[PDB]
Amino acid sequence: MELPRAFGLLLHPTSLPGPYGVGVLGREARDFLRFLKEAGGRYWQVLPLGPTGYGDSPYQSFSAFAGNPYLIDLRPLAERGYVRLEDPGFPQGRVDYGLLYAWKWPALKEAFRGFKEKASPEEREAFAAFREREAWWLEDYALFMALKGAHGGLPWNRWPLPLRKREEKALREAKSALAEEVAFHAFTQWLFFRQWGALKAEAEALGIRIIGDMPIFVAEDSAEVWAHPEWFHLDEEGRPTVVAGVPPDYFSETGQRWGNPLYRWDVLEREGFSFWIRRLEKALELFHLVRIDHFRGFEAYWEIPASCPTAVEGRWVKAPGEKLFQKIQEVFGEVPVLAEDLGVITPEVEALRDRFGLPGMKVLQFAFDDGMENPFLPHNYPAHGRVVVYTGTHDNDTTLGWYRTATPHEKAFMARYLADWGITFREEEEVPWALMHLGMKSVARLAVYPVQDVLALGSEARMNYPGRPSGNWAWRLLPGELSPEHGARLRAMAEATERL
């Protein structure tokens, strides 16, 4: 794809400021788009937007199609009398998921009750039309969530066998018995997609493109795995027989056992890769570009026997990446995908990526732990510049946080390297800006930075810390924290590096 020389910001919607404990698809989101526009940014990047479970990770969703109900702006609903919003006492600067779970779900349920009572014919009609258009994934998602609620939150493969194995009779009975719960979940979806569609329209009016994100592998406890057992390696009881992960290395002698179910690629191929085509079709209704986590998995993946508690017993298995993207290209006439290609990749992975002109990534926080050969250093980037450079992603600490724990060698080499590129700094809080400037001076067509770096925040603002059991995905902006001055500084930088 042809990427213009520009810049953007990374900010998950939950991090947006606003009342009621979590960022939503409303005015604050529009304020951010306006801020981005004033700053000269042309891209807004978010993390996966599906519904979340224990851990609150957007990369482990109950569905590969559904939208996150927590992102629904409840104000438009209250403004119609559908519900009476109450603040239990949400904190500032962070999402308290426990409190959000206990409070927002009931608020959404109360709003649905109010809706069925006061909703106008136009609204009732639109909601019905939506349920009908999206049935191909919505029926399964809505019933999945209704059954989960009726079975104490248990994962689908722990529900009674008739429901678990989707016996027609039992399934139809459950759907009737849970008609109201099913409708409610469909209601949260109609709202999510309606609000996201309006926000996407606002971004487009401001000349902004949205970069979406999705994990290559779906979650074990999700609607699509339950509904399409034939697409994954499961045993008759719904248990994965093999799981995703990565081989042991110089860090984890045990490697990483992610646990995600793996695709029966042969079955998918015979079906014209329908699952993926559909997944991308839906994603393209929300985003202009979509990144796919662990992109190398389309070339080959580390397959771990589910019985193994670690990733030591795995083996590399080839996937039909070539054939899948040939299909994606013919169906969508192009491939609007960004490849997450960090870590150790192979010449075949790089080959697949370039073959379809997919831009890869570069993370500046990883460029100074060795020498001038480090692929993350700007002078080593491809001359075609089809790559996206970040100071750090959602999985990294904020740049100031990173700097404070960096090795003496790292800190010294960074300063010297910056000096070579005509960049300097005085206080440590300036490092985030110095690195953002380095990225903008680079040949990378796109430079995307987390808002926390624009604010020069410390480790307390880190989005996610792989391996840490708590405090993840919780950071939030404060109202007005992003000032016109932050915007003007970004714009001046973009102008000087010709990214406007």
Identified catalytic residue from 28, 73, 110, 340? 340
Name the nearest CA neighbour of 60 among 213, 220, 188, 295. Answer: 220
Identified catalytic residue from 96, 369, 395, 481? 395
Cα angle vertex 295, ends 292, 301, to 5°?
130
Mark 248-276 as b/e (b = at least 16 C-beta within 10 Å): beeebeebbbbebbbbbbeebeeeebebb
- In which residue are the tokens 């009016």 written? 205
Query: Please, are residues 115 and 77 in contact by the beta-carbon 8 Å criterion?
Result: yes
Cα–Cα distance for residue pair 361/112, rounded to 1 Å: 42
List of residues 6+ apart from 420 with CB closer than 8 A = none
One-letter amino acid for residue 46 of the chain: V
Q: How far is CA 104 from CA 183, 376, 384, in A?
A: 17, 42, 47
Cα–Cα distance for residue pair 490/42, rounded to 1 Å: 12
Q: How far is CA 379 from CA 383, 397, 439, in A?
A: 9, 24, 11
Identified catalytic residue from 31, 96, 269, 293? 293
Cα–Cα distance for residue pair 425/403, rounded to 1 Å: 13
Q: Candidates 3.20.20.80, 3.90.870.10, 3.20.20.10, 2.60.40.790; correct CATH number of 1-500?
A: 3.20.20.80
Query: Please, are residues 95 and 22 in contact by the beta-carbon 8 Å criterion?
Result: yes
For residue 213, indicate whether it is catalytic: no
A 10 A CB-CB count for 344 gives 9
Residues in the chain: 500
A 10 A CB-CB count for 122 gives 8
Q: Structure solved using which method?
A: X-ray
What are 53's two structure tokens? Answer: 């479970």
List of residues 6+ apart from 245 with CB closer than 8 A = 255, 256, 257, 258, 259, 302, 304, 311, 314
CB burial of residue 79 (10 Å; 0-12, 13-18, 19+): exposed
Name the nearest CA neighbour of 162 among 149, 175, 145. Answer: 175
Domain regions of the chain by residue span = 1-500
Query: Please, are residues 391 and 454 in contact by the beta-carbon 8 Å criterion?
Result: no
For residue 395, indicate whether it is catalytic: yes
Cα angle vertex 132, ends 126, 133, to 5°?
90
Name the nearest CA neighbour of 105 among 128, 78, 74. Answer: 74
**Integer distance in angstroms from the first to the last C-alpha of the chain?**
19
Cα–Cα distance for residue pair 287/264, rounded to 1 Å: 27
Query: Please, are residues 9 and 36 in contact by the beta-carbon 8 Å criterion?
Result: yes
Write a three-state SS string for the chain: CCCCCEEEEECCHHHCCCCCCCCCCCHHHHHHHHHHHHCCCCEEECCCCCCECCCCCCCCECCCCCCCHHHCCCHHHHCCCCCCCCCCCCCCCECCHHHHHHHHHHHHHHHHHHHHHHCCHHHHHHHHHHHHHCHHHHHHHHHHHHHHHHCCCCCHHHCCHHHHCCCHHHHHHHHHHCHHHHHHHHHHHHHHHHHHHHHHHHHHHCCCEEEEEEECCCCCCCHHHHHCHHHECECCCCCECEEEEECCCCCCCCCEEEEEECECHHHHHHCCCHHHHHHHHHHHHHCCEEEEECHHHHCEEEEEECCCCCCCCCEEEECCHHHHHHHHHHHHCCCCEEECCCCCCCHHHHHHHHHCCCCEEEEHHHCCCCCCCCCCCHHHCCCCCCEEEECCCCCCCCHHHHHHHCCHHHHHHHHHHHHHCCCCCCCHHHHHHHHHHHHHHCCCCEEEEEHHHHCCCCHHHCCCCCCCCCCCCCECCCCCCCCHHHHHHHHHHHHHCCCC
Name the nearest CA neighbour of 114 among 157, 80, 147, 155. Answer: 80
User: Longest Cα pair distance anywhere in the chain, in angstroms?
Assistant: 71
